[PDB]
Symmetry: D2
Subunit: 290 residues, 4 copies
């Protein structure tokens, strides 16, 4: 299965108490497929509040996602964790469920050296019959890998690509050039245009859950070299993203989904419950960009 | 239970497969009590490789520690996690086990604002009938709180203190003065002398698992104002820590324990296995300091 | 005078003792004008080793560049300094010499708040009959200004633009959209392509002293929306920049110039003298890209 | 001359326009010697707004300080600069004036490697018949040197010590132990107590310009190992420093001197002029501590 394309980092629906709302999650999934029209879903990423969940909850979410989606769009399961044993168990679980590929965030919290990071990745991919995408998000994990390091990880053919969520376009350009046979996904929605001209094979974002169409326009207009048109879309998109970040990223994307009849619900505590100011602000944003 | 004193951030023993060696763990605990003469154990912290473990593993460790220690020394359980639900679960579990106090690291990975950090802490301590200590350590989490932010936290009389794992002696001095009714624990073993003269109520450290005696000498001598003597101990203590750091912190402390018949074992992967060089080196360190 | 275009951050030639080599400076100037065909020169920047010089040395460089250029291409004078009085003295000197515009890096070393930085820029621009361009460069000064702060600075119509030397393409995109009437120059040579698709009005770089042709191509090709070709030139350019960076930026560009008969000379101590290895490598680089 | 002791980072008096107020400068000096009872003056440091001045102004201040002090107390001259040539010039100038020792901040702004920093320091001290004190302060420079690098620097017998202005007490302890023959000066006034128990040979501070008496008390009490008393004075001193920082470090110190008939004057622009609020707040602080 060719993985190129646009992927929504799947949001998960929780009730006020933090319980997973399967009905809501299924709606979010449906919205992404029928309304946002994304090529696939990225399940278990930062966007899905993955790290605030128990392993059994992670498995439930992977199950629901695969069940609702079936074979319509593609699926990438993020199974990274500070607990390698958990990451290995989740790789087998999602590989069995039929996920088209798996992804793993660089191990964090503790300060592992590269040798250890490599051991981590190889142990994950070498345990299942699947393909792995390296999840690199430096501003959260604090881990920054060089070009040669990525080269070492790529030694393994089962490691097919990387999700580049860093503002280093010099490194991105070097990656594109040094690894022509590897997939590179843009991780910053507000920087989709400059990333696409550097040759990314797709994008994985949290805002795609509601701004999927514009996202595809930017990506497509650019690939067709209608830059001035692409920049204009990126402009509106960034006006949208700016209000979202200003009003609380996750709460707001969910409130924007609610406005569309999707029961995206709450975020897991300690992520604040949306205030009245936030809800009213989220309503305005919907009126202005949708 | 007055919580002042010297606490070892309990190391855990793992077999070659990475699974908990209970016999080894009990020996580590016994070594701390009978040989290092520590006043208590800080269970579930970074030193215990806590964040690389599953919830069941954390629980088993909490039980083993309580069962082996019983009432001999004080016990603080670090139940912090990015998963607040798990944090509350472990808070109750350990409280039901008779732990003298609980501790929680600042929620990491995602970027939480103070309001949220304060909610996280209130939720934990308000769910059980115990006392909580704030685990700050910003060099791993990246979360730096101000004096007033600590004040807001200390607005809950069930939050009795803080484990200061920072090198800001200005903030340290401010807190000792601003909260004379709260406990303050030094977190940097190599800076024990300079922190004690500022009036901390004790220390929580990783190297205490083997260097507990010298740690007590630094702590006591300093409290008795025999600074010139406390410094000489700190000097030897720092020579030891410098060598342990250069050879691999966790792997070396365990190898130093193995040298004494304590089955400390391996470290949880992806933390590397000790090499022949490291093992030979650990032996040299043992002969030079023990 | 319309300031859009490709500007080389002028390098200065020094002999082994640190003396300004005038003959060599004029050759560097001629090379940029006659061979690299740049649209202008950015004098007194980091690349010109400006902050390692005395005020009168800076003055000599400004007069030399002015004289040698005649009226062939445009000229921008970097007059910023920790000493506001020197900045004002230099702004008047260069304005009187006929420089098309002045530039000023944010005051560094001491930690100034925005109010003070605003007073800094206003004091400079209000002292002369000229136009100013903000020199940001966050990695050497550690100063990060928000979009709103830039908004204030731009209140002054004499502050016509900013040299963007940061990797924040989100801020870049917002800058373009929010200030359509202000000039925005890219300061990162290895990211010219992604910066151009975002609407920058030109670029100011150190590598243009030798790669001005390819740099212009990347700019024009992108403007004409011929992305594929633009990316190819960026790739070869970044191959060059990577090698240069690995060998020693300033010393290597100067050695690349020496290979062409331009006596670019040494760098000012404490910047090291090129070693035999660096010189050998420099030759290889010249052969490979020129 | 033995350079141990309490040194005040000498403040400079400026008039509203920014001109050196020679009269007020002599009063600041007399105050430090007669009222603050310091052992010496550290001239031309950050506190002296040294980096916002021209070489001629720096020399003038050096002349005034030497003329006013005569041979009463010791004098250290900070001659560091991004311009190696200027530093050498100032090193000769101050040596000729009979300064007891010189000091040099690490070369900043540009990213010099260690080899180059070593060259910089050797060039300065090998140029005069004097002794040199390394000035670290990574808070404003961003230059972090290791124990081994300080080792190479100390290879030169003429490099007699280092002014430590970082919060790394680990490095401080290692330094004291590793270089028993070298001088170590504490640079953080609000951390004098914890630093002195580690064996620093003295201190250099900005707040000594008005708090020299208390500063001496902390230093001497700690040296006598009367910690409890030392901590009490550090507590009051830190209340003072906290108010000062809150109201504007440099402005407030000068205003506190004004209340005492010392024409400390203004700060050099772009450092903001004291507001009315600031001025009244300064009077309060004065009443509250003097």
């Amino acid at each position: 299965t060719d993985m190129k394309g646009i992927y929504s980092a799947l949001l998960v629906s929780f009730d006020k108490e933090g319980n997973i709302n399967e009905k809501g999650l299924r709606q979010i999934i449906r919205h992404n497929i029928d309304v946002c029209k994304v090529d696939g879903l990225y399940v278990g990423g930062s966007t899905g509040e993955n790290f605030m969940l128990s392993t059994d909850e992670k498995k439930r979410i992977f199950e629901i996602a695969k069940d609702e989606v079936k074979e319509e769009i593609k699926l990438i399961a993020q199974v990274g964790s500070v607990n390698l044993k958990e990451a290995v168990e989740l790789a087998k679980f999602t590989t069995d469920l039929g996920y088209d590929a798996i992804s793993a965030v660089t191990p964090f919290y503790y300060k592992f050296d590269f040798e250890e990071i490599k051991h981590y990745y190889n142990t994950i991919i070498n345990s299942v019959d699947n393909r792995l995408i390296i999840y690199s998000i430096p501003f959260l994990t604090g881990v920054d890998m060089s070009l040669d390091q990525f080269g070492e990880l790529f030694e393994n053919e089962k490691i097919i690509g990387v999700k580049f969520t860093a503002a280093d376009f010099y490194l991105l350009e070097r990656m594109r050039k040094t690894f022509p046979n590897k997939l590179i996904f843009a991780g910053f929605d507000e920087m989709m245009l400059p990333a696409t001209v550097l040759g990314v094979d797709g994008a994985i974002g949290s805002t795609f859950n509601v701004n999927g169409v514009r996202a595809r326009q930017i990506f497509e207009l650019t690939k067709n070299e209608k830059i001035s048109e692409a920049l204009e879309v990126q402009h509106v998109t960034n006006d949208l993203i700016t209000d979202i970040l200003g009003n609380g990223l996750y709460q707001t994307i969910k409130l924007l989904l609610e406005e569309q009849g999707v029961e995206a619900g709450y975020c897991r505590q300690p992520m604040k419950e949306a205030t009245d100011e936030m809800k009213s602000r989220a309503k305005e944003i919907y009126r202005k960009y949708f």
